[PDB]
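P.,

For your records, the input lines for the assembly:
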Amino acid sequence: TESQIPKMYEMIRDQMRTLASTHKIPLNIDHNCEVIGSIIMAACTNNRDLRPVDKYWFLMGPAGAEVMTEVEIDIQPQLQWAKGAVHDPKYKGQWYPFLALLQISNKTKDTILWQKYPVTQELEISNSLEIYANGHGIKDRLKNSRPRSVGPLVHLLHLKRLQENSPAVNGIRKSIVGHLKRQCIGETQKAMINQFEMGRWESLSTFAASLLAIKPRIENHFVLTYPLIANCEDFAGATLSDEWVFKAMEKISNKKTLRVCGPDEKWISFMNQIYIHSVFQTTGEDLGVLEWVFGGRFCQRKEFGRYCKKSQTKVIGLFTFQYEYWSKPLKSAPRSIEISCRPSFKGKRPSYNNFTSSFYDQVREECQKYMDLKVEGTTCFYRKGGHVEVEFPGSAHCNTYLFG
Amino acid sequence: TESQIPKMYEMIRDQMRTLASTHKIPLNIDHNCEVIGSIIMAACTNNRDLRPVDKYWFLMGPAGAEVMTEVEIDIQPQLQWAKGAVHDPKYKGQWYPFLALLQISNKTKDTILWQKYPVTQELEISNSLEIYANGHGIKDRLKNSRPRSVGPLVHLLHLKRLQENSPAVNGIRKSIVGHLKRQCIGETQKAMINQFEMGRWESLSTFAASLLAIKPRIENHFVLTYPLIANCEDFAGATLSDEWVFKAMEKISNKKTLRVCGPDEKWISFMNQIYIHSVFQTTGEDLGVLEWVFGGRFCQRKEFGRYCKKSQTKVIGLFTFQYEYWSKPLKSAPRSIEISCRPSFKGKRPSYNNFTSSFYDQVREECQKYMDLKVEGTTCFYRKGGHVEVEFPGSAHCNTYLFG
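Structure tokens returned:
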């Protein structure tokens, strides 16, 4: 799984710089990186969406003189390389699994900048559940290649979408139902997803309350973004289940060679937190968790007004990052629910005492059981510099999400 | 924006009196001024419509002996005068925005006397919402010059006209739709005007239904009428965002030189209120505020029969006006729109709980939002004699309208 990760990162950056440096697009602007990277992922999976030559919004200017303009770029050199990697045996079939993570993480910032809830509104549920709707708008081939990363609500939406709109549909339906079942580990949630496959959505609002109560398994992987990939010069130990990604971001952060673009200079801290939000998929993480782990307070979306248009994003400051702790990516669900004798032998023994003396209800019983659960994660958190097991004692910015 | 206002009123008035005084057309009758001004507006915007010499209805007679007749006039001295102001740099390109305001305000009297609902009927919606359809019949160049002043329905009708009428189609449509979005600040309405761009007029009645609850932003300005422009001898402090217009009108009213026309002498009060309705564009504004602001009851259209023909309209009395309050013209939208724990830590925390225990729905949801809030406005009213903020206490003639 992680064997092919080191080789993918190096050429992604190589193509990241090749497209940018061809038309004098500096890579120290996030918007230059995000837009070019958006062009980059366009060539990766949906090769026909992007034009071979097209004008995109870029920050053109030498030594901080970048101004908003549309610059035509030639993507054909990048198009040929990406298509040959689709079925290249050198990746052992991990190309589509690797590309699905990239599409979700990079489009996450766009969802962060423009707060929208497409899946939850389309699933007539609470809007606070779009965290469980991760992986929306991704390619269905990616959604089949890495379905575990794609949130159940997106699959539930695709389950709803599939019913709304062919033997190959089964491999789309049974898998999407399977990803819903694999992601949602709740005993009541698994069966109550199956009735969604039947076509009834009266418990869909129950799924709205269940998701808040029982947390489905959401597999995660630490993947960098285009501004960081173009600024990362080391990929020797590029894996997906250690502190290398955390160390890499600190190395990039210590370099301070990357700038961010926003409506105004107040967003420098907000979008510095966005990098931590996007890379580790911690957009919905508790703001104090990202505070203790990353040594800095995390702002809320409510602290800022409407995000400026992509046609007017202006450089506001240098990207900064710091971390004091970390953890392995969340493989299973963070919340898990995993005094007498029966002498089966006829011989006489002393006896000892260890004690002195509906469907929605079962969902609520499981829902209330997960209210009782207070510890999350799989094994533990790890301190910076290694995999030393560290368990959190308590914080101050608790109880608050980025969108909460 | 308001820098050139003092000079525009003087030069408009100078040729306003020049055209009337050339052929001995008295300026103390409303009908003479309005018809002369109807000739004045013709030379300013649509030069190719009015004849260089033509006969129009005026009141000919000395010292109250005026009688309806058609008087030929020579508009050519005003025709060449007006065309030179079209692209004169002295106005800084504000000639187009200024002429739109004059065209809308002075056509109000014709709409008040002749109650018509052209936009709503062509939009197949409730006829009681043509007041929302402000700025109908105005020049398209003016409509592209001050689209904010032109009501959304008129733009929506022009949007409907544009679909029921080419790169110029998109340019007009984007101006129409873009200023449709600016006028309607509603989050649901903004997306619900979007399908009107393509031509999905099924929610057009729902748009009328929405217009009942959500009240869009309409930019207004205080512009005098031709009977007042020709009778106003002071334009030194002529601006658009203070009490000067209210004070300038009162001096004209105190002069008691201008006379008004009507089918019979009962209309003296009705036509006096028309000046208030025409200048401040308060045709569909509540009588209670009008009674509170201006210290007098406002007669409705139902209290009088159909307006007699302009050929048989007779002078019915002297123009009068009085006011006690005012307000800065509506710039932003008149309507105003501006609980649980989500653990992610591994730490032991004091638990806090803040709770003890379809598209049309969203459209009705935002509709209900304006229903719930009991304030329609942001800052204040103002009293006569200055800009002292005087909050509106209430009135007995509330919920009663000129066409309501």
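Two observations worth noting. Chain A has 15 helices and seven strands. Strands of chain A lie at 53-60, 67-74, 259-262, 314-318, 325-327, 381-383, 389-390.

Regards
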